[PDB]
Amino acid sequence: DAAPGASKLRAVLEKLKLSRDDISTAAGMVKGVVDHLLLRLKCDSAFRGVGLLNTYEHVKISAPNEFDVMFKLEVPRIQLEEYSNTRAYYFVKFKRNPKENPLSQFLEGEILSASKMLSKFRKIIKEEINDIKDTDVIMKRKRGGSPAVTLLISEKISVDITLALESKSSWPASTQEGLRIQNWLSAKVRKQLRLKPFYLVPKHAKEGNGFQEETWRLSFSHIEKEILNNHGKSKTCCENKEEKCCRKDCLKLMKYLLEQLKERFKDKKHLDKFSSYHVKTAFFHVCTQNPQDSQWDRKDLGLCFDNCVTYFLQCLRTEKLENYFIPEFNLFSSNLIDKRSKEFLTKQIEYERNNEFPVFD
Amino acid sequence: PHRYRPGTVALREIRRYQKSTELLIRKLPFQRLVREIAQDFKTDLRFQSSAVMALQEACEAYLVGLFEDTNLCAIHAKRVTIMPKDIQLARRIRGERA
Amino acid sequence: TRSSRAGLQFPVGRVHRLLRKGNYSERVGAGAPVYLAAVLEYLTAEILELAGNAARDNKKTRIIPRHLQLAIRNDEELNKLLGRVTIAQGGVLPNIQAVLLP
Amino acid sequence: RDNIQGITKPAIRRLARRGGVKRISGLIYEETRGVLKVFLENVIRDAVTYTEHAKRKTVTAMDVVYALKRQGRTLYGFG
């Protein structure tokens, strides 16, 4: 066997810089649209606590012209009801609130209605983006059983806005044994990231017959961004010129490779299954498998990229990708992802692996 | 001379002492006062030190609540400066002077 | 135990002993210390919940009486409950009047 | 005598700044000193009553706590 060439992987990184050269106009367009929309949310009295969580989140690094802009909303303390032992889908019940914040006034019964929230959220967006002058922002289809709220800013700038609840409470009990950055960063950094707030995004339970259920799954984007800014066991990783690692490098390599496979083999009905969040969680488990900055060195660029490919293929074959935050939650379940889809992705990544990756040029 | 305006250092002291929680009254003169009044009542009473600490907690929290009500009285009278008539008003409403 | 039998955390047996010792009445019903330990458990849970949330808001992982003071005095209904009560080592709320500001 | 004078002017000023007070009159200090003396006279009267009831010679924290209990000014942290 042989590792992929580190010069070739740095050439792919240079091609990734060439992919992300187009920030400076799309960032201005989305900043103008976010500015106008945030200065029209303040006109509404029933949503006076909404906000922009500050995470520019390139989930799609192979094409940075599409944005997924997340909004935060400061909520009261929430009693959480787990749905159907699914270990990730929870019900939002505002436990007790004497101030009577208007989200509770919008609520139905005791469970916060996610469909009602996303419906009136779409209603306010459709109503307010019409008012935008000299910036053609139109309401794209909400289909696909996802957060959606697709907004196109006038030339291929597809912004998928998803408002997210942010509870500053304590973490749920299923998130206890997770965040295994103890031997990777420290137990103290683990406990300090545990002190940071968690997030709530909707998805109805898509298990066969479950339709428009009011479930709420946890998001972990900000902790993952903060550990991407501090990723070495040594705290000056990719900061001084003796500790240039390949964690950011191999992670961008894996995510670009997955998104180029999803762009090429994009025939309908198979793509919806895979995301680079899965690759990022598998990469965090590779960081658990490879904890040392000596085991992420620049001479180990091809070796760590190979280890990431083989561990993602391990998660595809053994059908087990635990969340790095929830140990009791496999992201590669057989009902969210089809088994022929798992075989196809395993076959394509093995196909690209065993022929020295001819996609890299 | 880098002299502030007469309200700015007052505002940072308000931020500091609402941020702080420690005892503002010095412990030993408070202990002398407590021992003085108790010696006036019953001679040669030894004191638990935690009892003196509890007395100081009660006195400081009582005076802080009194100063909140005094500040509300002084702001209420279209003023900004407290006066002892504000304190007499606040205790008369609480029912200590009447 | 009766705490395990009621699924509660507070010791129902100790509450039953204290109701017998405290001379509140001669006879003490069986569901009374169960109900009382439940009410104590709910109050302690909500107050420690607010205190730990304030401690996370001040990034402290150890609960000190400052956070208890802030938690009780920031809930207006708990403030209505404990308006007379002084917490020791508590301080007060951060509360600046709007006429003072420039 | 003069131990009541131990309550200093900047201590009362620190209490006022914790109380949110912007400006302080010059006569505030003796008024506050007298009010604190009255409050202490009440609490120490109750505490001496509890102590002489206990047939003891040492004032303890629990006696002060029950004194503040019957005052209504309920304190935690010492029982």
Next chain:
Amino acid sequence: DNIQGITKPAIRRLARRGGVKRISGLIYEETRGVLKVFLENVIRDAVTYTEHAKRKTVTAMDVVYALKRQGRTLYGFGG
């Protein structure tokens, strides 16, 4: 309604018993609000006493115990 049944000159008679020489025109609505809050509290606790006795007739003594636990003790009706 009955909050208007608390009339302007009845509030003025109550203030003249209290000794108020001059009354603004906005005092009355605020007095209606304060009176409504106070009766909400007292009738809340009194009806709670009445429900405890498994009865539907609010006695005087239940109102006395409600006012007692609020701290506004009234003599001369039961206890």
Next chain:
Amino acid sequence: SRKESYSIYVYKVLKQVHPDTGISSKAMGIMNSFVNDIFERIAGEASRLAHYNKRSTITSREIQTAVRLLLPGELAKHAVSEGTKAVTKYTS
């Protein structure tokens, strides 16, 4: 001798709510005196209430009405709901 405190029970409720959060000894004294205060208030008002109906047996209904009288509104409603749930679980 022995002391009668609620310290380990407060700690168990803490691990139920905030599982990896510390609490000082002074804050534990606060909560011990608080639990003694709330127990004293509720047991006293149940004693007064049973005396009002001349009943020599404090029941769970007595404690329920004592919570409804003493504790303010929505928190009392939640607490009565929790206590009723726990008593019904104890009966089974």
